[model samples]
Target: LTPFLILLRKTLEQLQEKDTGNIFSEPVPLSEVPDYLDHIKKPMDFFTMKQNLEAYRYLNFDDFEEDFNLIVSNCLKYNAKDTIFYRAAVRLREQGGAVLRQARRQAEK
Candidate 1:
C-alpha cells in the first residue's frame, strides 16, 4: 500500500479506539435501533469505513473525512440531544476531526 493509504489505515484503526460507547465501531443493529435504516439515508460505521478503506474506495483524505463525518452526523441525527449516544458522537466529531487533520498533516511530512 502507498503511504497515503497506510496513513489512513492507521488513522482509521485508532479512530475506533476513541469510540467511548463502542457503538460507532460497528453497524447499528436492527434490534437496538429498529428505525435506523429509515432515518439514516446513508448509514455509516467504522466497520463499513474499514471495508471501504481496504477496498480503496476513498480516493483522497477528504473522502475519508466524509465518512468520518457521516458516522458522527448519523449518530447525532438518530439519538436525541440528551442521550449519551448523541454526546458520544459530539465528542467524536470534535476529537476525531482534529485527530484526522493531524494525520493528514503527518502525511505531508
Candidate 2:
C-alpha cells in the first residue's frame, strides 16, 4: 500500500535481473548445497524477499533492507571466498546498495 514499495520493487527487480546464472535470484537448494542450512542461520533470497513484500511482511524500509542484505550475507557465509559464489555475492552486496541509493535519488524528482 505504501509508495515506498514501488521503489523497493523496482530496485529489487534490477538486482535480480543482473544476478549471474540467476544464482542469487532464488533460494539455495538443499539438494545442491547440503551444508548451506548448517552455516547460514538466516537464509534469504530474492524470491523470498519479493514474496515478503507482497505479503506485507515488511513493516518498514529497514526490514526490507535487512532481508536484502541478508541475501548476500547468507551467501558469503555458506560459500567460501575462493569460490565464484563468494565473488558474485561480494559484488551484489555493493551493487545492491548502490542501486538502492540511485533508485531513491530518482525518487527526488
Candidate 3:
C-alpha cells in the first residue's frame, strides 16, 4: 500500500478504537477560547520550531499560527525567503497545515 493509504488506514483504526460519542467530549465555552492562548506560553523559537519541522516536516494544524510565524520569522532571520523551506512553509500554511497530524502519526512508527 502507498504511504498515504497506510496513514489513512491507521487514522481510521485509531478513531474507531476510541469509539466515544459525546460522552467523551465536552464543548468548549466560546469565552474560553482566548484563555487557551496561554497554553502555548510564547511563540516557539527558531531552533525548536525547526526541530519540530525536521521531525514532522509539516505545519501542525491545531497550532498553525505558532508554527507559521516561526517559519516566516526564521526564514527572514536566515535570509532564506527564496529557498525550498520558505516555499514549503507557505504551501503548508495555505493548506491550513494539512497532513500534519498524519505525518506525526507516521513518524511514531
Candidate 4:
C-alpha cells in the first residue's frame, strides 16, 4: 500500500506539473498548453484540480488566454470542462476502473 500510494502520488505530481506548464526543471517564462490536463482532470478532485489550475496564474499572464483557449478546446472535444475539479473526478474514476479491471485479470491469471 505504501508503494502504491507513493507511486500514485508521484504520478499525480507529474500530471500536475504537466498541466501547469512547468514540467521541466527550468520553467520557461512563456506559457504553453499543458499536455496532460485533459487526461488527468477527468477523475481528479477539486483540491487537486484547483492546485494545478491555479498554477497558471502564477505564470506570466501574457500566455494565459492562449493556453486557456487550447485547454478549453481540448476539454470540449474530450467531454471535459474548463473546471479542473470536473476533469479530475472523471479522469480518476476512469483510471481507477481500468486499474481494478486489470488487477482482477492478473489475479485470475
Q: Is candidate 2 or candidate 3 better by TM-score?
A: 2
What are the RMSDs of all candidates, in order?
A: 1.4, 1.8, 15.7, 13.6
RMSD (Cα, Å) of model 4: 13.6
TM-scores for all predictions: 0.91, 0.86, 0.26, 0.27
Rank order by lDDT, top first? 1, 2, 3, 4
- Which candidate tops lDDT? 1
Most accurate candidate by TM-score: 1
- The CA lDDT of each predicted structure is 0.89, 0.82, 0.41, 0.39
Q: For residues 13-84, what per-residue lDDT tens digits would candidate 1 score against the true structure?
A: 878988977889888887887888889988889999999999989989998999999999999999899999
Q: What is the lDDT of residue 25 in candidate 2?
A: 74
Model 4 TM-score relative to the real fold? 0.27
Question: How many clashes does each candidate structure show, in the order listed?
Answer: 0, 0, 0, 13
Residue 70 C-alpha lDDT in model 2 = 89
Residue 12's C-alpha lDDT in candidate 1?
Answer: 93
What TM-score number comes out for model 2?
0.86
Q: What value of lDDT does candidate 3 attain over all alpha carbons? A: 0.41
Please report the TM-score between candidate 3 and the true structure: 0.26
Error of 4 at 22 (Å): 9.7
Candidate 3 lDDT by residue in tens digits, 1-109: 2454445334333432332221112222326546533443343333443354445544333343355455434433433578764564455344433444554556467
Displacement of the residue 62 alpha carbon in candidate 1, Å: 0.8
Better structure of 2 and 4 per TM-score = 2
